Write a protein that binds this ligand. Structure first.
Ligand SMILES: CSCC[C@H](N)C(O)(O)c1ccccn1
Ligand SMILES: [Co+2]
Ligand SMILES: [Co+2]
Ligand SMILES: [Co+2]
Length: 249
């Protein structure tokens, strides 16, 4: 959406805080021996406490409060009896609405230690890619600068991006204009960012695969080659004085 009023701004900040709090609480609770359903139950309780509703449940009839994707799963994983293990690469993606307004945020991290440093590397590079993307965000700037920055960051680190997962506008719905915030540069795109525009920026950095495919069920996205993939996602408001992240707290 485009923010035009202080009441809209406040509503976005409220739901962003709630999603950040949930994301942080879930991440802190992720340890070997917890199941992904038990982690999802944290979101259930917190959404109730804060008067928010799961966007996956509301918008998509997704069977889970949140999306929790482990190892071979990159996105849209269904919380279940799956147990977290030492060295897992976990993505927790929290999106919700309150009073009609939305936020969307996500983080990938390594549980304990993996024997392969590549798991942490993709996380480190996803973080850098996010930072580099938002350093580009201002009214009048090209949307495509975001994907250009993300892919350049990946290349600087000998990594790839997931080309077929994107960010998106957010605000009155989970997904709205701009339709797609790519992870790479499209030289033909003339779309600009504008003052008050709200978008979810979510680089996906991969150790090998450049795309995801349908996974073990009708929701999860995976890589057949079991690439290590990390996401960092925030909801961002484009302002004259710099990007405001509703989901950073
Ligand atoms: C209601 S379904 C949840 C969608 C998710 N929060 C996402 O928009 O960030 C996303 C994640 C992965 C790929 C694309 N989009
Ligand atoms: Co998300
Ligand atoms: Co999405
Ligand atoms: Co998103």
């Amino acid at each position: 959406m485009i923010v035009k009023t202080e009441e809209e701004l406040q509503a976005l900040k409220e739901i962003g805080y709630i999603c950040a709090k949930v994301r942080n609480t879930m991440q802190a609770a992720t340890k070997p021996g917890i199941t992904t359903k038990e982690l999802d139950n944290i979101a259930k309780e917190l959404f109730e406490e804060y008067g928010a509703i799961s966007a996956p449940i509301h918008d998509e009839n997704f069977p889970g409060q949140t999306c929790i994707s482990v190892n071979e799963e990159v996105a849209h994983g269904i919380p279940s009896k799956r147990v977290i293990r030492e060295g897992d690469l976990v993505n927790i993606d929290v999106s919700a609405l309150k009073n009609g307004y939305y936020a969307d945020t996500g983080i990938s991290f390594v549980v304990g230690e993996s024997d392969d440093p590549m798991k942490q590397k993709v996380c480190d590079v996803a973080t850098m890619a996010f930072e580099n993307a938002i350093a580009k965000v201002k009214p009048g700037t090209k949307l495509s600068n975001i994907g250009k920055a993300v892919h350049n960051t990946a290349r600087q680190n000998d990594l790839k991006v997931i080309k077929n997962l994107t960010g998106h506008g957010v605000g009155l719905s989970l997904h709205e204009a701009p339709a797609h915030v790519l992870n790479y540069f499209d030289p033909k795109d003339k779309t600009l960012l504008t003052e008050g525009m709200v978008l979810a920026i979510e680089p996906f950095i991969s150790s090998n695969a450049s795309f995801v495919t349908e996974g073990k069920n009708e929701w999860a996205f995976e890589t057949s080659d079991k690439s290590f993939v990390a996401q960092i996602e925030h909801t961002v408001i484009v302002t004259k004085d710099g990007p405001i992240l509703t989901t950073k707290i």
